[PDB]
Design a protein that fits this description.
This is part of a larger assembly, with chains A (415 residues), B (78 residues) and C (116 residues). Helices cover 35% and strands 0% of the residues of chain B. Chain B has three helices and no strands. The radius of gyration of chain B is 15 Å and the shape is globular. Chain C is mostly helical. Chain C has five helices and no strands. Chain C is elongated, with a radius of gyration of 24 Å. The relative contact order of chain C is 0.08. Classes of the chains: A alpha/beta (415), B mainly alpha (78), C mainly alpha (116). Chain A binds one DNA strand of 11 nucleotides through strand 3. Chain A: Belongs to the MCM family.
DNA sequence: TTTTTTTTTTT
């Protein structure tokens, strides 16, 4: 049963192969796919020897304008996971109830004690009530509830990972303010979440076809005229037969970043990475011990842990700070990413802004946008790659419906 | 012992360092003055109050947690 | 948004049912699109001309400063007279444009968009 | 000792 899993984990490249196995339908969002995959298997719930009770649960909080498949991300995790439950925010704790059959006034379980080891899927987080809000926070940093109700005084257990999605105020997330404004949530609550993914939207021509075609086709094959087998048995197996260890070679590899970034953030209107972010990073350290069976901390997945713990912090920032901190760190951290995506980041904007120009004077939603070449390498000089032909050959940009011409220099955009 | 003052105010905030005055004062609140009743029954206070103004930089939450933990009776509220 | 798309195939299917057919054709989708097109109306205001020249300049002012130093305040004002006054010709319209440009460029101040 | 509907005092 494991004899396959041995080499399948020893592929050394199971990351990409597993990321695109969750979120089976919904296109895009290989960013948030990463975070949610980190959350699913979890981390390591180590017991600190100083009686401090650090927790081993990853809690996520989506957010973004309506119509971006948040609820589907909740519903699919209902299925793939195990012993999961679900709720809306528009029953969270055990309550006295008159039994249907026995006709005695017993106590019934709520909705945070039915995930005592699995996951708790909260929906419509904003619509929670004041009692619900004062009751949800207690279980985050204590993971234990007391019930001195009409029934009897008890103290039960609740060890669940929370997966919720809020909404943007004003019907749209606007990134001029900080994320702590468009979320409409009490401030010491957002600290109780490890990841803060921000879903957003933009009118982008080349993705309109990509999303349309997908939906239309999903309406063609549903009416009366890594697959779902490897990863379920894999979340069953890899949950059990690993116990990640912790050496002390990474203990100083991070502080060199903190000492810099704390100043970098405090310099402007923001609060830098604080200890409740280092805890999340060190929790997501082991989040890959479950995928690789690695279980040994290495300077490799620390490049991943720091990368993620800043990924979930640069987005929740101000207008020009979300880009100033990027110009510093996204180039500083030496992102262990594609050399090609950084190529697209340029000409995507250089064609989108040109369309925005050619609309505010003409107005015609023109067919074939035209952009000469010279502009691209001008900005490529900043990242120092200057590679176009090896990218021209790469089919990682044909899908984005572009072109190039050697004698015309035109990056012709069709759609 | 002669230097009885600083020996406490040194071991009441190990993690956070800097400006022991903000730790000097906290030493007194743990002891407090004494409750007097004048002939008129017009009692007097027996406790003190402290304000730590400044930006929330999480350097103070540690101190709150400490003073709550090391207190005969104590509650930390949001 | 997206939900308008999942609501265009529905109208086409409901149009096809009507003609007792068993498949969707372009003849149906064209009409199911015309209907959903007349449904949404354009918001109005007592002003579209005065917003063309709000972002025709801040597309002539963002890319122009992130690479070089900045632009002359007495020259970016004329650039608009140096791009779109090159085709339409009436010797009166020059100062009649300059006055409205000065007023709007004093206006850009209170939105906190174009400051000097 | 539970819902649901309707009136009036209270934070
Ligand atoms: N990228 C996408 N891929 C597939 N379906 C999508 C996508 N974006 C939106 N949808 C559709 O939108 C619906 C999700 O809406 P939802 O996020 O629940 O709205 P709200 O957040 O307001 O509750 C899904 O049923 C799905 O059909």
């Amino acid at each position: 049963d494991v004899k396959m899993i041995t080499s399948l984990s020893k592929d050394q490249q199971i990351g990409e192969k597993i990321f695109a196995s969750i979120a089976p339908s919904i296109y895009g969002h290989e960013d948030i796919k990463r975070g949610l995959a980190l959350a699913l298997f979890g981390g390591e719930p180590k017991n600190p020897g100083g009686k401090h009770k650090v927790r081993g649960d990853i809690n996520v909080l989506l957010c973004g304008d309506p119509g971006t498949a948040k609820s589907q991300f909740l519903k699919y995790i209902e299925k793939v996971s195990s012993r999961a439950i679900f709720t809306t925010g528009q029953g969270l704790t055990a309550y006295v109830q008159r039994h249907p059959v026995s006709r005695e006034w017993t106590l019934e379980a709520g909705a945070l004690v039915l995930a005592d080891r699995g996951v708790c899927l909260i929906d419509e987080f904003d619509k929670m009530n004041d009692q619900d809000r004062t009751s949800i926070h207690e279980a985050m940093e204590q993971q234990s509830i007391s019930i001195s109700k009409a029934g009897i005084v008890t103290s039960l257990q609740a060890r669940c990972t929370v997966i919720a999605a809020a909404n943007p105020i004003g019907g749209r997330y606007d990134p001029s303010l900080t994320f702590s404004e468009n979320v409409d949530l009490t401030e010491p609550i957002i600290s109780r979440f490890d990841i803060l993914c921000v879903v957003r939207d933009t009118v982008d021509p080349v993705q309109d076809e990509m999303l349309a075609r997908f939906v239309v086709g999903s309406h063609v094959r549903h009416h009366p005229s890594l697959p779902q087998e490897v990863l379920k048995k894999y979340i069953i197996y890899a949950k059990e037969r690993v116990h990640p260890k912790l050496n002390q070679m990474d203990q100083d590899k991070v502080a060199k970043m903190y000492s810099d970034l704390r100043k970098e953030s405090m310099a402007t209107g923001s609060i830098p990475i604080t200890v409740r972010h280092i805890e999340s990073m060190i929790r997501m350290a082991e989040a890959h011990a479950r995928i690789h069976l690695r279980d040994y901390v290495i300077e490799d997945d620390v490049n991943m842990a720091i990368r993620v713990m800043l990924e979930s912090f640069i987005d929740t920032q101000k207008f020009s700070v979300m880009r100033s901190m990027r110009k510093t760190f996204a180039r500083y951290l030496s992102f262990r990413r594609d050399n090609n995506e950084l190529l697209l980041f340029i000409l995507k904007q250089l064609v989108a802004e040109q369309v925005t120009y050619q609309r505010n004077r003409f107005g015609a939603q023109q067919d074939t946008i035209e952009v000469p070449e010279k502009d691209l390498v001008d900005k490529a000089r900043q990242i120092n790659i200057h590679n176009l032909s090896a990218f021209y050959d790469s089919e990682l940009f044909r899908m984005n419906k572009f072109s190039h011409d050697l004698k015309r220099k035109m990056i012709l955009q069709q759609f | 012992l002669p230097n009885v003052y600083e020996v406490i105010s040194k071991s009441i905030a190990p993690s956070i360092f800097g400006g022991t005055d903000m730790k000097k004062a906290i030493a007194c609140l743990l002891f407090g003055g004494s409750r007097k009743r004048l002939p008129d029954g017009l009692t007097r206070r027996g406790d003190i109050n402290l304000l730590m103004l400044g930006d929330p930089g999480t350097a103070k939450s540690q101190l709150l947690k400490f003073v709550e933990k090391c207190s005969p009776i104590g509650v930390y509220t949001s | 948004t997206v939900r308008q798309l999942e609501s265009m195939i529905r109208l086409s299917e409901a149009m096809a049912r009507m003609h007792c057919c068993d498949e969707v054709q372009p003849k149906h989708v064209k009409e199911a699109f015309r209907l959903l097109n007349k449904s949404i109306i354009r918001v109005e205001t007592p002003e579209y001309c005065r917003i063309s020249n709000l972002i025709v300049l801040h597309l002539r002012k963002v890319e122009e400063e992130e690479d070089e130093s900045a632009l002359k305040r007495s020259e970016l004002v004329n650039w608009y007279l140096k791009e779109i006054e090159s085709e339409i010709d009436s010797e009166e319209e020059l100062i009649n444009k300059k006055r409205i440009i000065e007023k709007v460029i004093h206006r850009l101040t209170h939105y906190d968009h174009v400051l000097i």
